[PDB]
Amino acid sequence: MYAVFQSGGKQHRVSEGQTVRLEKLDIATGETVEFAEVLMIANGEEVKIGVPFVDGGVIKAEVVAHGRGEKVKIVKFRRRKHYRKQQGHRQWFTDVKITGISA
Template identity: 65%
Template sequence: MYAVIVSGGKQYRVAEGETLKLEKLEVATGNTIEFDRVLLVAAGDDVKIGAPVVEGAKVSAEVVSHGRAKKVTIVKFNRRKHHRKQMGHRQWFTEVKITGINAG
């Protein structure tokens, strides 16, 4: 059984027992969170597609940790001007473990 959820403006395909990194959520480590914006639920040949969401479907997950991703380097360069600027960015994320999928 798997589902497609929306979190942080992005869509994720999740299955029970899976661990994934989402955009930062303001939830303490160890707490449970429920995603009610479920776009699709599939169990074998039985597929429910929402318009836009599947009514009554929920995906529950446990917050494992918070952290920052690897650094992305941004380089800005102007030719012939002896100008170079280098910056970096590390995006915050929340790591969650999917504990259950309720098809509704």
């Protein structure tokens, strides 16, 4: 049993009990978040396709952590033209655990 939802401009296919990393959500680090749009729910040969959303489908999760990702480096170079530049980046995320999915 899995379900598909949209969060952060992206779409995810999750199953009950999984840990999924998303873009940052401004919610404290201990409580429940509800995803009330579900694109499709499949439960072993019974499939519910939403047009565009499944009627009354809810996914329940629970935030686990906040943090920053791994660092990347940006390098810009122009040969024979006396130009150089460098920069670093580190991106925020949010971790949730899928608790219950039901139509």
